[PDB]
Amino acid sequence: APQQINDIVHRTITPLIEQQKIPGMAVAVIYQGKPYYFTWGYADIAKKQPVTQQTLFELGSVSKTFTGVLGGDAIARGEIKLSDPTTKYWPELTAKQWNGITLLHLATYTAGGLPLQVPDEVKSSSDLLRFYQNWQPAWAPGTQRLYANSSIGLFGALAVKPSGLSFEQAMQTRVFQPLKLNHTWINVPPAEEKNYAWGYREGKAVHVSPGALDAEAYGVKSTIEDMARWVQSNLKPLDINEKTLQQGIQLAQSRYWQTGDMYQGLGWEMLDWPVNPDSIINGSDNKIALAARPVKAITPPTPAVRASWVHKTGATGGFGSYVAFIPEKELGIVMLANKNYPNPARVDAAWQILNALQ
Ligand SMILES: CC(=O)Nc1ccsc1C(=O)O
Ligand SMILES: CC(=O)Nc1ccsc1C(=O)O
Ligand SMILES: CC(=O)Nc1ccsc1C(=O)O
Numbered sequence: 378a379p380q381q382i383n384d385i386v387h388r389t390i391t392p393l394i395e396q397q398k399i400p401g402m403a404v405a406v407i408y409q410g411k412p413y414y415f416t417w418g419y420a421d422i423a424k425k426q427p428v429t430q431q432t433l434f435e436l437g438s439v440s441k442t443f444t445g446v447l448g449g450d451a452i453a454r455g456e457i458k459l460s461d462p463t464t465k466y467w468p469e470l471t472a473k474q475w476n477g478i479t480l481l482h483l484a485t486y487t488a489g490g491l492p493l494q495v496p497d498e499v500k501s502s503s504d505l506l507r508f509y510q511n512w513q514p515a516w517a518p519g520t521q522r523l524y525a526n527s528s529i530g531l532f533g534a535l536a537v538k539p540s541g542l543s544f545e546q547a548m549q550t551r552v553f554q555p556l557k558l559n560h561t562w563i564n565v566p567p568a569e570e571k572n573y574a575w576g577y578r579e580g581k582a583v584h585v586s587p588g589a590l591d592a593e594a595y596g597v598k599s600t601i602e603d604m605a606r607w608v609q610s611n612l613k614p615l616d617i618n619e620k621t622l623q624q625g626i627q628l629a630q631s632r633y634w635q636t637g638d639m640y641q642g643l644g645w646e647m648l649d650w651p652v653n654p655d656s657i658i659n660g661s662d663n664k665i666a667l668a669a670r671p672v673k674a675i676t677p678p679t680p681a682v683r684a685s686w687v688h689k690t691g692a693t694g695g696f697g698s699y700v701a702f703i704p705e706k707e708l709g710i711v712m713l714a715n716k717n718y719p720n721p722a723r724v725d726a727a728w729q730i731l732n733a734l735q
Contacts, residue, residue, distance in 0.1 A: 378413040378415075379408075379413075381734075382406055382408060382413055382734065385729075385730055385733045385734060386404060386406060386413075386415050386730060387415075389726050389729050389730050390402065390404060390415065390417065390726065393726050394417055394418065396722070397716065397718040397719075397722060398716070399417075399418065399714045399715070399716045399718060400418050400419045400422055400577050400714075400715050400716055401416075401417065401418035401419045401420050401427075401428035401432070401574060401714065401715045402416070402417045402418055402428060402712070402713065402714045402715075403415070403416045403417075403428050403430070403432060403434065403600075403601035403711075403712075403713045403714075404416075404601070404710065404711065404712050404713075405601050405602070405604060405605035405608070405709075405710065405711040406709070406710050406730065406734070407605060407608050407609060407612065407702065407707070407708060407709035407710070408707075408708060408734055409707050409708075410609065410612070410613070410707045412602070412605040412606075412609070414430050414601055414602070416428045416429060416430065416432075416601070419715075420432045420572075420573075420574035420575065420715065421574065421575050421582070422575070422577070422582070423575075423582065426574075428574065428715075429572075430600065430601055430602050431560065431572050431600055431602070432572055432574050432600060432601070433560070433562070433565060433569065433572050433573045433574060433598045433599065433600055434574055434598065434599065434600075434601075434696055434698060434713040434714070434715060435574075435576060435584070435585050435597075435598050435693045435695065435696040435698075436595075436597045436598060436604075436691050436696075436698050436713075437585075437595050437691035437692040437693040437696055437697070437698060438594070438595050438689065438690065438691035438692060439597070439690070439691030439698045439699075439700055440592075440593075440594065440595050440596055440597035440691065441529050441594065441644040441689065441691070442607075442611075442629070442644040442645055442689050442700070443548060443552060443597055443607075444529060444530075444532070444533040444593050444594070444643075444644055445484065445529075445629040445642060445643030445644025445645060446552060446611075446622075446625050446626055446629045446643070446644065447536065447537070447547060447548055447551060447552050447625070448480075448484060448532060448533065448625070448628075448629070448643055448644075449624070449625030449626060449627070449628035449629040449643055450551050450552065450621050450622050450624070450625030451536045451537065451539070451540065451547075451625075452624075452625065452628055453620070453621035453622075453623075453624035453625050453628065454540075454621045456536075456539035456540055457480060457535075457536055457538075457539060458480070459479060459480050459481035459484065460479055460480075460481065461479060461480050462475070462476075462477075462478070462479055463475055463478050463479065463480060463482075463483060463531070463535065464476075466480075466535040466538045466539075467509075467535060469506055469510075470506075470509060470510065471510075472509075472510045472511075474489075474512070474513060474514050475509075477517075477518045478514075478518050479518070480532055480535065480536065481519075482518050482519060482528075483528050483529065483531050483532035483535070484528075484529055484532040484643050485522070485528075485529075485633050485634055485641045485643070486522045486523055486524050486525050486528045486529065486641070487518065487519050487520070487521065487522050487634060487641075487672060488514065488518060488525075488528055489514030489515060489516040489517060489518050489520070489521070490514050490515035490516055490521065490523050490669065491512065491514075491523070491525045491527045491528040491531075492512075492527050493523075493524065493525050493526060493527070493667065494526055494527065494588075495508065495526060495527045495530065495588065495589040495590055496508060497588070499589045504589075505589055508527075509531070515669075519634075519672070519674060520671065520672065521669050521670065521671055521672060522634060522636055522641065522669070522670050522671075522672045523668075523669045523670075524666060524667050526590060526594035526595060527590065527594075529593065529594055529644070530589075530590030530591075530593040530594035531590065531593075532593070533590070533592070533593030533594070534593055544563075544592050544593055545563045545564065548563060548592075549563075551621075551622065552622065555617070555618070555619045555622055556606060556607070556610050556617070556622075557606065558599070558603045558606060558607065559603070560572075560599065560600045560602070560603050561597060561598070561599040561600070561603045561604075561607075562597070562598050562599070563592045563597060563598075565598055572600070573598065574696075574715045575695065575715060576693060576695015576696045576715050576716070576717075577695055577715055577716050578694045578695045578716075578717065582695075583694050583695040584695065585693045585694065585695070585696075595691070595693065599713075601711060601713055604700065604711040604713065605711055607700075607711075608700060608702050608709040608710075608711055609709075610626065611626055611630070611645075611687065611702060611704075612702050612704050612707060612709055613704075613707075614626040614627050614681075626681075627680065627681045628643060628681075629642050629643040629644055629645055629681075630642050630645050630647065630681035630682075630685070630687055631643070631678045631679060631680050631681055632647060632675050632678055632679040632682065633674075633675055633678045634672040634673065634675060635672065635673045635675060636670045636671065636672050636673070637656070637660065637665075637670070638652075638653070638656040638660065639656075639660060640675070640679075641672070642681075642687075644689065645687050645688070645689060646687070646688060646689060647682070647685045647686065647687045647688075648685065648686045648688075649682070649684065649685060649686075650684050650685050650686045650703050650705060650706075652686045654725075654728045654732070657686060657688070657724050657728060658721050658724045658725050659721065661690055661720035661721050661723070661724040662719070662720055662721050663720060666690065666720065681704075683705045684704075684705045685704060685705070686701060686702075687701065687702050687703070687704070688700060688701035688702070688724075688727075689701075690720045690723065690724070692717045692720075693717070694717065695715060695716070695717065696713075696714065696715055696716070696717060697714045697716060697717045697718050697720075697723060698711075698712060698713050698714065698723075699711075699712045699720075699723040699727055700712075701724075701727050701731065703731065703735070706735050708731055708734060708735055709731075710727050710730055710731060712726065712727060
């Protein structure tokens with residue numbers, strides 16, 4: 378890599394790893410389109426396995442970007458539309474509060490206060506139906522944003538219904554394969570287990586446990602190389618051969634709602650570039666990110682703006698990830714770690730890297 382990039386990356390990540398006590402980390406910088414890779418530390422402390430460019434990390438909520446793009450692709454195919462009532466694809470959702478709640482609301486956390494997590498007590502598909510049927514909205518549709526796995530998770534599950542494919546099959550055939558993400562998985566295959574990092578939570582080695590709508594909301598695992606390709610694909614959707622996928626990516630980066638300085642896409646979140654570093658850094662803290670906030674409708678949505686900071690924060694019990702990119706600049710970063718360390722530290726590091734290179 379160019380010395381400039383190396384110096385910028387190392388001066389930023391070294392003290393981060395030290396401050397946060399991160400066991401293992403992989404970083405990719407996309408500079409003028411190309412990828413440059415950096416790795417530190419351990420995928421498995423016990424077995425002394427280093428982080429490599431082939432190491433799989435749990436993406437956590439960064440998985441929502443894939444869900445958003447897969448959803449976008451389904452819209453491009455004419456299989457669904459964001460203006461459809463939720464009941465169009467789940468007719469058993471007959472309870473009256475579901476009148477007026479569309480796929481858009483589900484995809485953008487604006488249904489009216491669906492909870493962050495699906496209750497752990499939900500074990501069966503009958504349990505899941507009951508949960509949504511009995512759920513009482515705090516607010517009218519499209520008035521408040523509340524970040525929720527139970528919201529985008531349901532969107533993901535319903536978006537693939539007309540296809541007649543399972544969520545995993547749809548994701549694999551329509552997103553992973555066309556983009557050549559051959560080491561990106563919802564379920565890690567036995568063949569790839571050797572590369573699967575352990576997450577670390579309070580010193581303990583952990584992997585994400587099964588849960589309702591896990592695949593749709595937080596269930597993707599990936600390598601630093603595949604995530605770099607994912608950034609490249611989102612930076613330049615036009616170079617993608619598969620028409621509906623190209624359009625899906627653009628739909629995902631469209632601006633549907635505004636809250637403060639931020640815009641809600643499908644999975645992706647965006648801010649106007651140049652950004653105020655304090656608004657991305659402070660805004661990434663869960664104090665703000667997980668809070669219920671009033672939204673202003675963007676009527677109609679603004680097509681993907683190239684002058685944007687597009688990004689997504691993501692975590693599991695044992696992992697912390699961050700992806701950010703600026704289409705206008707052909708510039709991006711992926712940060713994957715096997716520790717959940719605070720969002721603002723992630724965004725601060727990303728800012729100081731991308732700022733230095735722009
Ligand atoms: C629909 C789904 O994700 N599966 C489901 C529903 C209730 S529990 C559960 C699971 O996967 O554990
Ligand atoms: C094939 C299939 O799953 N179709 C289905 C299931 C719930 S809604 C829907 C559709 O095609 O609209
Ligand atoms: C897996 C999951 O629910 N992640 C979660 C919960 C609150 S913030 C967050 C994330 O992935 O950033």
